[PDB]
């Protein structure tokens, strides 16, 4: 399948080169997979989600996304126009308040929630979790991310936006999950992207168009935007049978575009997520 005039990041993940604008993908499109977006919530009524999104958990007085961030990330995973995996099921877990903040104990609870809750959902092709959030190093936050991964969920986490080594942030620094840095449309490391040995992969993260609250759309930047590209890619590849939740991060790194990015510090992988789809 081909989607013309796609957001640059979708085109980038199906291309060997920057500078194109059509997204190419197998029409299975992540059908039969599930992606949990652990964030500020999801505006599931947005037409772009087509009934495939739902809130399943909140830790606040409401499940509504009063911010937009979680809706944007969910849109990059799986919206019809802005998403990588256009037929995945999206599940919202609101661990962040409408200011975008949350206590680590709530974030931990949300991760353990997903590890259990997937047993209440139909995801025959597999389960992914997208965590576009983080803070300073916490062994308890890392352990929760490790448990979620161990339970059979492909965990993708943002590297962080400090232009610093991600070893000092969580859950970015957990080795067993998939830690995602950000790139721009000219194949430069995004100026704010964290780096370091703990990164597994880069995805598009500067000037990413996606869904927003109020039935709208907007372009924003962050490792938060790169992470759902990788989460959606994992769901798509799992539906194709190419990999599994336990192996998807390694598979994505194995099959990534290699050496294309500029300003990658020595010791950080030069790997850009790529679906290897041949139309």
Helices (H) and strands (E) counted in the chain, each on its own, are 6, 15
Q: Which helix (H) or strand (E) holds 27?
A: none
Instruction: Give the burial class of 262: count Cβ atoms within 10 A of its Cβ; 0-12 exposed, 13-18 middle, 19 or more buried.
Output: exposed
Q: Give me the domain span that covers residue 93.
A: 1-279
Which of 5, 2, 11, 3 minimizes the C-alpha distance to 229?
11
Distance CA 4, CA 14 (A): 12
Q: Measure the CA angle with vertex 191, ends 178 and 110; round to 5°.
A: 35
Counting the structural domains of the chain, the total is 1
Which of 104, 95, 119, 121 minimizes the C-alpha distance to 38?
95
Q: For 192-221, give the DSSP string.
A: T--BSTT--EEEE-SSEEEEETTTEEEEE-
Residues tagged active-site: 39, 69, 224
CATH number at residue 246: 3.40.50.200
Experimental method, per PDB record? X-ray
Cβ count near 121 (within 10 Å): 14
Tokens of 167: 């070893």
Distance CA 154, CA 130 (A): 8
- Reduced to 3 states (helix: H, G, I; strand: E, B; else coil), residue 93 is strand
Preceding peptide of 171 cis, ω within 30°: yes
- Reduced to 3 states (helix: H, G, I; strand: E, B; else coil), residue 276 is coil
Which residues lie across from 171 on neighbouring strands? none
Which residues fall in the annotated binding site for Ca(2+)? 16, 175, 177, 200, 260
Going 206 to 211 to 213 to 219, the CA torsion angle's sign is positive
Tokens of 173: 């620094």
Which residues fall in the annotated binding site? 16, 175, 177, 200, 260
């Amino acid at each position: 399948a081909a989607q013309t005039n796609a957001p640059w990041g979708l085109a980038r993940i199906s291309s060997t080169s920057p500078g194109t604008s059509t997204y190419y993908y197998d029409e299975s499109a992540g059908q039969g997979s599930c992606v949990y977006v652990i964030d500020t919530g999801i505006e599931a009524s947005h037409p772009e989600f087509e009934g495939r999104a739902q809130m399943v958990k909140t830790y606040y007085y409401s499940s509504r996304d009063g911010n937009g961030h979680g809706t944007h990330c969910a849109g990059t995973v799986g919206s019809r126009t802005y998403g990588v995996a256009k037929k995945t099921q999206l599940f919202g877990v609101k661990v962040l308040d409408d200011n975008g903040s949350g206590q680590y104990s709530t974030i931990i609870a949300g991760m353990d929630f997903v590890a259990s809750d997937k047993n209440n959902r139909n995801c025959p092709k597999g389960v992914v979790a997208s965590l576009s959030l983080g803070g300073g190093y916490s062994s308890s936050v890392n352990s929760a991310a490790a448990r979620l991964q161990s339970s059979g969920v492909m965990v993708a986490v943002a590297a962080g936006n400090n232009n610093a080594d991600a070893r000092n942030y969580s859950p970015a620094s957990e080795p067993s999950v998939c830690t995602v840095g950000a790139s721009d449309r000219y194949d430069r490391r995004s100026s704010f992207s964290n780096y370091g040995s703990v990164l597994d992969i880069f995805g598009p993260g500067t000037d990413i168009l996606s869904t927003w609250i109020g039935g709208s759309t907007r372009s924003i930047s962050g490792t938060s935007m790169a992470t759902p590209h990788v989460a959606g890619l994992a769901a798509y590849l799992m539906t194709l049978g190419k990999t599994t939740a336990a192996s998807a991060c390694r598979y994505i790194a194995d099959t990534a575009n290699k050496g294309d990015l500029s300003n990658i510090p020595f010791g950080t992988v030069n790997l850009l997520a790529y679906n290897n789809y041949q139309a």
